[PDB]
Amino acid sequence: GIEPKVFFPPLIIVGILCWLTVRDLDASNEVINAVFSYVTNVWGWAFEWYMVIMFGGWFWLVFGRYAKKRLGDEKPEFSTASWIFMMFASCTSAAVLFWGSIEIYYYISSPPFGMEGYSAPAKEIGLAYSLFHWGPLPWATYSFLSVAFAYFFFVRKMEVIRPSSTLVPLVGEKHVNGLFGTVVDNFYLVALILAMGTSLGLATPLVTECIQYLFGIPHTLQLDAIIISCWILLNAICVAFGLQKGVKIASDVETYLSFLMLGWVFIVGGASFIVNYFTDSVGTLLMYMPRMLFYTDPIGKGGFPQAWTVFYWAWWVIYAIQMSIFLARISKGRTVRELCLGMVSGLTAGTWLIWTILGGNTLQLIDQNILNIPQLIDQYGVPRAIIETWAALPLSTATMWGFFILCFIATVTLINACSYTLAMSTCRSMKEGADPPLLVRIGWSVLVGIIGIILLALGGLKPIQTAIIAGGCPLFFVNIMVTLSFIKDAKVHWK
Template sequence: MLKRIEKGIMIPSILIVLGISFGIIINPETSKRIITQTQEIITNQYGYIYIWYGIFAFVFVIGISFSKYGRVRLGSKEEGPEFKTFSWAAMLFCAGIGASVIYWGVIEWAYYYIALPYGGKIESFQAAELAATYGIFHWGPVAWSIYAVSSASIGYLYHVRKVPVLRISEACRPILKEKVDGILGKGIDVLFILGLLGGAGTSLGLGTPLATEGIARIFNIEITIFLEIAVLLIITLLFAVSAYSGLKKGIKILSNINIILTIFLLLFVFVVGDTIFMINMGTSSIGVLIDKFPIMMTWLDPVGKSGFPQDWTVFYWAWWVAYAPFMGMFIARISKGRTVKNMLLGSITFGSIGCAVFFIILGNYGLNLQLSGSYNVIDSLSNFGGAVTIINILETMPVSKVIILLVTIVSIVFMATTFDSASYVMAVTVHKKQVENYEPDRWIRVFWALTLGVVPISFILLESELSILQTASIVAALPVTLIGVLTAWAYIKMVNEDR
């Protein structure tokens, strides 16, 4: 059983995760200060690296899609797509955004509304339009391009060259050559696992409080540490079972169910809310986004020094970068039979539109409450925080208990689909040579699923801040930008060599 495991990747990953987690837990204040200061240095002094990487990713994905490199089919010409388009889109969307899109989709506009970029007047109509637009930008084409960059080289290696391993380091082999077999290659894969664990912590840190608050409100019970742990255990059990079931029986089915529930939720809010306001503001937001897209992509505010692009755009790009190797591997794995163009454009199209719908419907529902005076979202955020405010917003809807229950279920399943996808990819990474369409050993899939759940549970039990682990993953994302560039270069090099 252990003979099939790449111990040089798995053991260091486990030891480093345990070491970092133990250090944070026993000395949280010092850890928080060091990691936060490092993050501030990176975002303030080197934020331009993330901004330029976002530009590179967007240009690369669009450029490759409409060139000869986009016509490459991932598999033989006789093979059709392994997954139907609905299931394929559902899996990549659920893996890529988790419950975070529900959390930020409802309230992200509020932070922009009172801290407007470009020196504009806060709480003005211009502020409302920009606030409704910036979330769509941060979760839009650039974000999904960052996710998709590595998928071309990984997909080509796995489905065309039939390389019997599926790792981010392997995607760098055309450039790094035999160095991939040494400590450098192992380091790349370990860095990938660490970034994924930290990124998963970010999603859990947002999704768990929301699900916990929803359960407490539905059953009118007090939020305790035991309730938080119970919610995490439910999520862990759900994605452990799904991971055990595999790609086609677990992840695919869970993703399909979640997308159907999500569509119902969005349609309900769209109908019971101010539908015309949502349509009008959504239309205006698309226009503002098209108008200001180049500025949003490049703005770092070196003169005004508001900190807005560092706190938001740079942070988001770093978050996407930390998750990008995982998403590149996952997108590549499920895209057999598709062309590279179909894979890349499908990823940014389905991903961007899916996220935009959340912000246009859920976000504008909350924004309309604020503008109409029906509910003061800004004050609620200041006094009660994000999770409570979101549930309070949902309580303004008809049959609110049912909607809160639905949001709670969707949040839990979103987290489960993200983490079962993550545990699957981590299991693939630590496996040695594989055969096509193989499934990694069940025990290793379940092991990583439990690891993803145990780490945040340990933080909660020992009353340590999970946000420290989240910040650490953002810090670790900086060198991943170089890996993304290497994989992009590798794809072009491989296609040119083979054709």
């Protein structure tokens, strides 16, 4: 049974946002590029203090009165080996192969700190910035929530699907099940939908360029509309006929494949450089870290932090509860100090590995003038430029297959987990473990695709960026509210 309380509002709005946008894709990019410019240039610092304060809680968790506190109070389900590996595995997606490949070009073209284009000082700081946006520092700002939920799930033995179920000890039962609790759940879902809808906007064009390389078929917006539909079908069949087995295997193979391609690119993409460059960019990270963390550039108005630093932070703000729930669900029976520790390590190892192998590889192709990225981007768009970095490797076809398969099924498990995440939080609380209403699952998977297409239809990265930054604005609060509950609540039932 559905919950009209949280079902109808987002479906209306997300329907409306499509309506106005799809009606005139010219005026949209005149406001898409106007909404983005506003938020980042005046509220960019808000995200950054958020990321430096949640960073404080990390040290407070590890070194506070809750450090040796054990959540759940029993033996863990997983061995540390499997447990760590499950985090290590969760770092594979479509958007990562996308960012892991091209992010270094944008750091090297128009660098931060007023450095010159393609300068050596810019190639120094190039990788080091990826290690910052995707390192132990944003992962640390997830620990407060992953501990929060693992606390609620296991210490307080409750069960939350929607975040409002956590705000009980700050606004009381009156507000929670009232209007206040629905305003946040309507927001959280809408912002979630955009965020997950953008993951498709990044995913499909990667998958289609692989297709264009292996099969020769022309990359068109009409083709992007196909694969998305085929993904809906693939998932619609998978849910209806149970098939929860096969999806898990595919998700397994995606992980084990991800290691092969990384190992591949690392092996033949100059292993000597990558190790050196990494080493050189770890020390460059640690030195400039407080500068990157508090960057706004108000005196030169370069636009770097606003472009990358705050937009990433908005991408991190969003998937907080989304991912912190996951980390909580698996960190059963552990103590909060060893959660935050094994988490940050195991995660960072996954993300650092990708950006250095893929990014350090991309740099070499720019360095050795093998490839002209600015030309490819102006002509065919971003995902083409990325695909050609993969193509500039020995055994291109086997490689492009290796990514094609990867970048494909990585989105299949993305859509399957998405429809689930929504339908559970969209319907009414049935018995836990049960599968969401088969039909409502489908509907969301289609509702996303429309957005994904539109985001592809508008063209460029700006719609993606603006969609997530927008969604990151309310979830800015929602995230703190969930933490403020734990902090308040744990002050009572833990000591």
